[PDB]
Write an enzyme that holds these catalytic residues in place. Structure first.
Site, mmCIF file in Angstrom:
data_model
loop_
_atom_site.group_PDB
_atom_site.id
_atom_site.type_symbol
_atom_site.label_atom_id
_atom_site.label_comp_id
_atom_site.label_asym_id
_atom_site.label_seq_id
_atom_site.Cartn_x
_atom_site.Cartn_y
_atom_site.Cartn_z
ATOM 1 N N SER A 176 19.968 16.049 -14.160
ATOM 2 C CA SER A 176 21.007 14.725 -14.426
ATOM 3 C C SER A 176 21.146 13.235 -13.917
ATOM 4 O O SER A 176 19.330 12.842 -13.682
ATOM 5 C CB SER A 176 22.189 15.266 -14.453
ATOM 6 O OG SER A 176 23.649 14.687 -15.883
ATOM 7 N N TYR A 177 21.845 12.866 -12.748
ATOM 8 C CA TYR A 177 20.819 11.404 -12.605
ATOM 9 C C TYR A 177 20.535 11.929 -11.010
ATOM 10 O O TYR A 177 19.355 11.107 -11.592
ATOM 11 C CB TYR A 177 22.336 11.515 -11.515
ATOM 12 C CG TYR A 177 22.093 9.516 -11.642
ATOM 13 C CD1 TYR A 177 21.632 9.008 -10.636
ATOM 14 C CD2 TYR A 177 22.676 8.481 -11.779
ATOM 15 C CE1 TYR A 177 21.688 7.628 -10.047
ATOM 16 C CE2 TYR A 177 22.444 6.828 -11.922
ATOM 17 C CZ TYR A 177 21.784 6.488 -10.958
ATOM 18 O OH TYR A 177 21.135 5.112 -10.351
ATOM 19 N N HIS A 191 23.890 20.430 -21.558
ATOM 20 C CA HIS A 191 23.935 19.938 -19.997
ATOM 21 C C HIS A 191 23.564 20.164 -18.750
ATOM 22 O O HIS A 191 23.130 20.612 -18.135
ATOM 23 C CB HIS A 191 24.606 18.644 -20.114
ATOM 24 C CG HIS A 191 23.810 17.269 -19.077
ATOM 25 N ND1 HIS A 191 23.294 16.437 -18.839
ATOM 26 C CD2 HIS A 191 24.661 16.125 -17.401
ATOM 27 C CE1 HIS A 191 22.615 15.775 -18.076
ATOM 28 N NE2 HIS A 191 24.045 15.812 -17.858
ATOM 29 N N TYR A 250 21.259 13.909 -6.177
ATOM 30 C CA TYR A 250 21.950 13.214 -6.982
ATOM 31 C C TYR A 250 21.216 11.915 -7.027
ATOM 32 O O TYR A 250 21.132 11.359 -7.579
ATOM 33 C CB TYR A 250 23.071 13.738 -6.961
ATOM 34 C CG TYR A 250 24.087 13.283 -8.299
ATOM 35 C CD1 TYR A 250 23.547 14.372 -9.846
ATOM 36 C CD2 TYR A 250 25.091 12.923 -8.288
ATOM 37 C CE1 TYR A 250 24.544 14.032 -11.093
ATOM 38 C CE2 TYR A 250 25.660 12.391 -9.557
ATOM 39 C CZ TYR A 250 25.289 12.933 -10.780
ATOM 40 O OH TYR A 250 26.427 12.558 -11.555
ATOM 41 N N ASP A 258 21.415 19.326 -25.802
ATOM 42 C CA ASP A 258 22.654 18.511 -24.596
ATOM 43 C C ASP A 258 23.340 17.158 -25.476
ATOM 44 O O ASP A 258 22.078 16.446 -25.913
ATOM 45 C CB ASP A 258 21.796 17.857 -23.893
ATOM 46 C CG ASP A 258 22.683 18.000 -22.642
ATOM 47 O OD1 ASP A 258 22.965 16.828 -23.015
ATOM 48 O OD2 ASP A 258 22.136 18.065 -21.316
HETATM 49 C C1 LIG Z 1 23.638 10.291 -16.197
HETATM 50 C C2 LIG Z 1 24.738 11.880 -16.780
HETATM 51 C C3 LIG Z 1 25.687 11.747 -15.216
HETATM 52 C C4 LIG Z 1 27.280 12.322 -15.513
HETATM 53 C C5 LIG Z 1 28.418 12.064 -15.366
HETATM 54 C C6 LIG Z 1 28.712 12.413 -13.696
HETATM 55 N N1 LIG Z 1 29.814 12.302 -13.307
HETATM 56 C C7 LIG Z 1 30.394 13.351 -12.157
HETATM 57 C C8 LIG Z 1 31.097 12.446 -11.528
HETATM 58 C C9 LIG Z 1 31.951 11.420 -11.934
HETATM 59 C C10 LIG Z 1 33.600 11.822 -11.906
HETATM 60 C C11 LIG Z 1 34.785 11.161 -12.954
HETATM 61 O O1 LIG Z 1 35.356 11.470 -12.293
HETATM 62 C C12 LIG Z 1 36.430 11.992 -10.383
HETATM 63 C C13 LIG Z 1 34.763 10.908 -13.877
HETATM 64 O O2 LIG Z 1 35.448 10.442 -14.783
HETATM 65 C C14 LIG Z 1 35.510 9.653 -15.717
HETATM 66 C C15 LIG Z 1 33.596 10.972 -13.855
HETATM 67 C C16 LIG Z 1 32.627 11.575 -13.557
HETATM 68 C C17 LIG Z 1 30.624 11.624 -13.934
HETATM 69 C C18 LIG Z 1 30.889 11.407 -15.791
HETATM 70 C C19 LIG Z 1 29.325 11.007 -15.894
HETATM 71 N N2 LIG Z 1 29.947 11.972 -17.060
#
Ligand SMILES: CCCC[C@H]1CN2CCc3cc(OC)c(OC)cc3[C@@H]2C[C@@H]1N
Ligand SMILES: CCCC[C@H]1CN2CCc3cc(OC)c(OC)cc3[C@@H]2C[C@@H]1N
Ligand SMILES: *[C@@H]1O[C@H](CO)[C@@H](O)[C@H](O)[C@H]1NC(C)=O
Ligand SMILES: *[C@@H]1O[C@H](CO)[C@@H](O)[C@H](O)[C@H]1NC(C)=O
Ligand SMILES: *[C@@H]1O[C@H](CO)[C@@H](O)[C@H](O)[C@H]1NC(C)=O
Ligand SMILES: *[C@@H]1O[C@H](CO)[C@@H](O)[C@H](O)[C@H]1NC(C)=O
Ligand SMILES: *[C@@H]1O[C@H](CO)[C@@H](O)[C@H](O)[C@H]1NC(C)=O
Ligand SMILES: *[C@@H]1O[C@H](CO)[C@@H](O)[C@H](O)[C@H]1NC(C)=O
Ligand SMILES: *[C@@H]1O[C@H](CO)[C@@H](O)[C@H](O)[C@H]1NC(C)=O
Ligand SMILES: *[C@@H]1O[C@H](CO)[C@@H](O)[C@H](O)[C@H]1NC(C)=O
Lengths: 728, 728
Positions: free
Chosen positions: A592-593, A702, A509, A670
């Site tokens: 994703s990431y 997604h 990740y 997505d």
């Molecule tokens: C390129 C794709 C990446 C996607 C997401 C990954 N997530 C998972 C961890 C996380 C945890 C948070 O609060 C604990 C959180 O609070 C806004 C956001 C996120 C992010 C948000 C971002 N939308």
């Protein structure tokens, strides 16, 4: 001789984890559903009763999707016809059942297509959102009062969040916060008028002759973002025909200076509210403390009483400014903040005093504050045995901060190393939830002397079933990279033998403040890859990963697609040199990431990986939304960080993909990481004459989580890896 | 001959076919562009000179795309800033260069983004289309006169076709027809107000932050079609003060009843226009003959000289009603009609008389009428040797229809069995162009005593290069199914040996009136599969195919997805009998209709095929357009043909695909066969748990023809067949 954990085992969920989800409803009782009777338990003694009979709602005429019980227990919300939107948002119909009677209320019903509903914290008042406007019910069978009139689809949002706020700031669709009295209703308003729209096709069932175009306000990096207003309404003074008055609280001048965000709302006392605000450049945040004025009927936020958090090393908070937990009177509160060493620990703040006092310190971090009483503050940290991916529950006595007890470490040390907790009101009892490395274990406890009361679910059934299968094992350990400790985990095949060489899959990740090497027990693809295909699946937490302080987490500030990519390559090199991995068969994959990193790795030219799979990858920071991206990358203007935005796309490394087998997958609907992203990856590969494999999933988003899609994608990737590894 | 015909050769065009594209400009001269010099030639003597030196416009500043020379030789149109729209439509900038002088014209220039230009047929008047309106120019340097004012982007089309009319009806963007005098300008006008829009994403260069949504009016089967009106303007009577007077010609009452199309427009004489119309149920068509009334100023169409065409067994014409060729006086015309035995022949029509007279008959068909003079009609047919896939020029003496000479059959019989022709004005000279089986040969002839004058291009160069390559051979032959001949062609690898077993690829198209088995010489992908990969590549022309009469061609009327499909399976079965084919390695592939059939074959559960490839396939006829689909399928309503519409989808066969290995590819910006069609296939294979491979090509259309995309799909398909056939 026992059977192996098969791809079909994972797919059909043959070996299930049992759970024990409860809802505390007082200081000594909780709700639990058993054989779908909603029951109440007495924590002290374990005795249970039937709150709502399983049988009730047999003749109701619709499948009931969820429920919610009024706090002062006279009513229950029945949620049905649930239709899902984004990650948190959904729409639904609601009925209300009067309990002191065997009756559903038939009059003044909450409308169909409702966007959100909530009981006040005490009593039975209702607040809901329909066509983007807020509505309040004082009693379940009476007309609602209309609080706002400005609501408009995709444009004006009252009391619910728009796409970015749902996904990145609040992690909720909701944007309502009642007072503890239930007197005051606070709500945020979002305006997206000038926010551009991402557009894409949804094909739907075969029968649809023309495809639909889904259009969603989504501010991509550096675009015009939404704006927000914040309001408070006295809910006790409302009139059947006369319009309700909403008092607006304005953000502090130091934010109105430019683009900013509402980041947190938290009531302190019946007359004081806390607002955390954050600048579009996520460097500076301000906590505002606002008190209600008996005289004026308004809310004043004294400037001298503001609290400021800045970061010189990166951004504020882990994904957001941390939550403040207020002592009972509302004069002081506790908050996680990065200390001078860069480690996140608990700081004590007094309201008209400036600095704060660190109550925890050292080379580890506090993960969350979970409960506070006047004698104790209970928090979860990764302190135990210096393992960053473990989790325990600790206790501090507020009369001496050195007096700290760990409440969960030694309860079951070999089996449980990853806890989460759920305290009753006033923290008289707590449910502990162990998540690995053994099977998950749920327990109840009493706080007066921290005694173990029972055991609520031990997953014994799972244990018996698993004994009959060749399960893999997990290694958690660390390597050194340039004077520093970085952890990794391996999922090793059964009867692992270090004198043989195994093919290795790097599960990645690596997004900011992520953690992929930990102590939790999972049953997933990797389990199958290892148990049936004898493949080592490995994950590594490098620069940019979290819970081990800022030096490491912020190393990647303003520089995504950099140290985090290098470090995944170096970890693989080092896995190569372990006598047990064959260097001719190392792959990489992620989502994703995870897909961005995987892609950036495959396009690095390292030579270390033979093949990889990127699911739903970001391919270019300018394509992803403003809140998440800018937090880590700043703005993509020449004045700021444009060069790196341009130097860190997957497209630019297109030529190097000729050296590897690449499978690219992405769902077409997505709404989060847009298909466009992978569409540009492929156009880039094509321009340069590189062959690769692809898979689009129609109408999937997604998570690609619809049952059949889920089975298909994992089927598709297993074929791919198997063949990359010359495994029949 | 040593070296092999290689994939890169195909893709890089190592071996070019030379051409001889000439443009007649009178009864005895033609222009020819050699290098970039324009050359004028004398047909009788063959001398030649340079009309326009390649250097003339060195300081023009813009790269010139094409040119059009006024018919009186006084001026030339230079086309630049060319932007391609759909198949025939495109926009461009234009300059006019005055020849007697050497001056560009600076006054009253044609505007940018012009959509269509055309010189009058005799002189140098101009008629162009900009912003969907028609403008006229008497003299290149004078102000233009605006003929219409109703033009509206995507809604009102004056003098150009909407999407369906461009692709399915006129095969052109133009909807203007000058009279032979240049006096009158006749133009059609389409109204797309109520036509629904197909919408799809277009991603553009990497730099575009937000994908653009393309929206085009496109009537899917059974939807609201466009409407049509027809006008004729007197171009000699225009004024700057007064507006242009357009005279409408209404369609026949028998068309006005319900939905209808304008199919053909043809001027007979200076004062007579021929118009054909067709009812939405394309089984009835009406030819109208209209005359100018010198006094009235109008145009009258006498219901009495109306000519009707109805089909009993299927639809009217091949892909539309055939075109009439009028004798010079206007009073009679010749036109290809299906005769009573079901074969397409030439029929003679006198304008106010009943019936028509067939001047050709027999078990074969006239392919086209190519020229008409006082003493002879020239046409092309497939009579020779009874070969449906051959073509030859014929002459008929009009004063005795039994006097029919073959002008091309015996010129070079072993090398040439497929000709086309181009006649000079008044037909005193003709260029023959043979296309196979040998290398293309282009020859000039005088009509008097059909004498050969010169050889224009003999491809000698290509010949010798090819002597040094191990080329495949081509077998053209037939099999007997019921009591009927069905033709196939095979492409055989060099050193073919009927004792060894070769893997076979069935290359299919198989849509109505198609012919895949013929005597044409081609250098293509199949060329490579055979020469380098030793793969036999077969095509078969079964039921629904054309140029063999209606029994065969209409057999698939209102039944697409049936006989044409079955017949291809049966053909592959037949090929297996033939002992040189390995029946464990038979594959199939196609594009467009070919895609559809391949997928229908692959899902028949036939067991015959191991794997196949589908590019840009139709998967549901309700998804494709109205004019084509309704031609063969009627309307998708319960009262007409809805059942078969629903029993003929690829989606329903989904389960059968578990039996084979399938590869599905589609361009994301296909405005013709929408990506939607494959998106629905993919989702159906997913809903039923069948694995398969896929590949979308971003921003490509139905041709997926940009060089890189072309190189990439053929690369990707090669790899797919190779592994399907266990070939390294
Ligand atoms: C390129 C794709 C990446 C996607 C997401 C990954 N997530 C998972 C961890 C996380 C945890 C948070 O609060 C604990 C959180 O609070 C806004 C956001 C996120 C992010 C948000 C971002 N939308
Ligand atoms: C299911 C997809 C197939 C679509 C295309 C097939 N072609 C090939 C044969 C042909 C021949 C014509 O004149 C000879 C022609 O004149 C308009 C159109 C066509 C059609 C046009 C239609 N666009
Ligand atoms: C538990 O037992 C006690 C004693 O009967 C009773 O007062 C209490 O209500 C019981 N609680 C529940 C939830 O059944
Ligand atoms: C209903 O509750 C009873 C009481 O234990 C339980 O045994 C039964 O199986 C449940 N019935 C349903 C509808 O599941
Ligand atoms: C909502 O839904 C039901 C059926 O879907 C309908 O009968 C009812 O009148 C609607 N209005 C309500 C319940 O608010
Ligand atoms: C939303 O903001 C826009 C400015 O973009 C403005 O026109 C509009 O009045 C605002 N609407 C509300 C209700 O705040
Ligand atoms: C051909 O030759 C004749 C006689 O010399 C000459 O007058 C004529 O212009 C020539 N035509 C061309 C196109 O060369
Ligand atoms: C067309 O565009 C070019 C550049 O904009 C300009 O030179 C010209 O004046 C424009 N208008 C015309 C040619 O009608
Ligand atoms: C086009 O058709 C629409 C729909 O019938 C009609 O209302 C409109 O006037 C038409 N426009 C023209 C210019 O013919
Ligand atoms: C010319 O004619 C059109 C309609 O025929 C009209 O709309 C336009 O305004 C006219 N102007 C003049 C110059 O009469």
């Amino acid at each position: 001789s026992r059977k192996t954990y098969t791809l079909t085992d994972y797919l059909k969920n043959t070996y299930r984890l049992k759970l024990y989800s409860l809802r505390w409803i007082s200081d000594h009782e909780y709700l639990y559903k058993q054989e779908n009777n909603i029951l109440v338990f007495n924590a002290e003694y374990g005795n249970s009763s039937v709150f709502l009979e399983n049988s009730t709602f047999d003749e109701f005429g619709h499948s009931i999707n969820d429920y919610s019980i009024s706090p002062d227990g006279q009513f229950i919300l029945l949620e049905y016809n649930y239709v899902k939107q984004w990650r948190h948002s959904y729409t639904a119909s609601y009925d209300i059942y009067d309990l002191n009677k065997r009756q559903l209320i038939t009059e003044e019903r909450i409308p169909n297509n409702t966007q959100w509903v909530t009981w006040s914290p005490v009593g039975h008042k209702l607040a809901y959102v329909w066509n983007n406007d807020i509505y309040v019910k004082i009693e379940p069978n009476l007309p609602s009062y209309r609080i706002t009139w400005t609501g408009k689809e995709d444009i004006i949002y009252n009391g619910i969040t728009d796409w970015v706020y749902e996904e990145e700031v609040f992690s909720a669709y909701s944007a309502l916060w009642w007072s503890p009295n239930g007197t005051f209703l606070a709500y945020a308003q979002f305006n997206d008028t000038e926010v551009p729209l991402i557009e894409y096709s949804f094909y739907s069932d075969e029968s649809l002759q023309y495809p639909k175009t889904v259009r969603v306000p989504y501010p991509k990096a550096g675009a015009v973002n939404p704006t927000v207003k914040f309001f408070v309404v006295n809910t006790d003074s409302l009139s059947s025909v006369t319009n309700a008055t909403s008092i607006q609280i304005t953000a502090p001048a130091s934010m109105l200076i430019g683009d900013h965000y509402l980041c947190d709302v938290t009531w302190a006392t019946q007359e004081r509210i806390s607002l955390q605000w954050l600048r579009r450049i996520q460097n500076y945040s301000v906590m505002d403390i606002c008190d209600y004025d008996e005289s004026s009927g308004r809310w004043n936020c004294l400037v001298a009483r503001q609290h400021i958090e800045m970061s010189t090393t990166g951004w504020v908070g882990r994904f957001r400014p941390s939550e403040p937990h207020f002592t009972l009177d509302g004069n002081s509160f506790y908050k996680i903040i990065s200390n001078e060493e860069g480690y996140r620990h608990i700081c004590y703040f007094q309201i008209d005093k400036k600095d704060c006092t660190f109550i925890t310190k050292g080379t580890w971090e506090v993960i969350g504050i979970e409960a506070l009483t006047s004698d104790y503050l209970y928090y979860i940290s990764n302190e135990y045995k210096g393992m960053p991916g473990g989790r325990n529950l600790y206790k501090i006595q507020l009369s001496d901060y050195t007096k700290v007890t760990c409440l969960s470490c030694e309860l079951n040390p070999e089996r449980c190393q990853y806890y989460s907790v759920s305290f009753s009101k006033e923290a008289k009892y707590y449910q502990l939830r162990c998540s690995g490395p053994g099977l998950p274990l749920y327990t109840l406890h009493s706080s007066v002397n921290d005694k173990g009361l029972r055991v609520l679910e031990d997953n014994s059934a799972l244990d018996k079933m698993l004994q009959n299968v060749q399960m893999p094992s997990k290694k958690l350990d660390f390597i050194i990279l340039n004077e520093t400790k970085f952890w990794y985990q391996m999922i090793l095949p059964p009867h692992f033998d270090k004198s043989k060489k195994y093919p290795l899959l790097l599960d990645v990740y690596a997004g900011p403040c992520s953690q992929k090497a930990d102590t939790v027990f999972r049953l997933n693809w990797a389990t199958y890859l290892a148990s049936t295909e004898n493949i080592i699946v490995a994950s590594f937490d490098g620069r940019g990963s979290g819970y081990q302080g800022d030096k490491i987490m912020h190393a990647i500030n303003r520089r995504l697609g950099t140290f985090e990519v290098e470090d995944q390559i170096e970890a693989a090199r080092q896995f190569s040199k372990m006598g047990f991995v064959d260097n001719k068969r190392i792959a990489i994959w992620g989502w994703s990431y995870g897909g961005y990193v995987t892609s950036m790795v495959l396009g690095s030219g390292s030579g270390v990986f033979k093949c990889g799979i990127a699911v739903a990858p970001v391919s270019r920071w300018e394509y992803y939304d403003s809140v998440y991206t800018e937090r880590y990358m700043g703005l993509p203007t020449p004045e700021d960080n444009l060069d790196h935005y341009r130097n860190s796309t997957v497209m630019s490394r297109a030529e190097n993909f000729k050296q590897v087998e690449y499978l690219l997958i992405h769902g077409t609907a997505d709404d989060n990481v847009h298909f466009q992203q992978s569409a540009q990856i492929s156009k880039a590969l094509v321009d340069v004459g590189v062959d690769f494999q692809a898979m689009w999933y129609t109408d999937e988003d997604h998570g690609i989580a619809s049952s059949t899609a889920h089975q298909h994608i994992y089927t598709h990737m297993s074929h791919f890896i198997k063949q990359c590894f010359s495994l029949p």
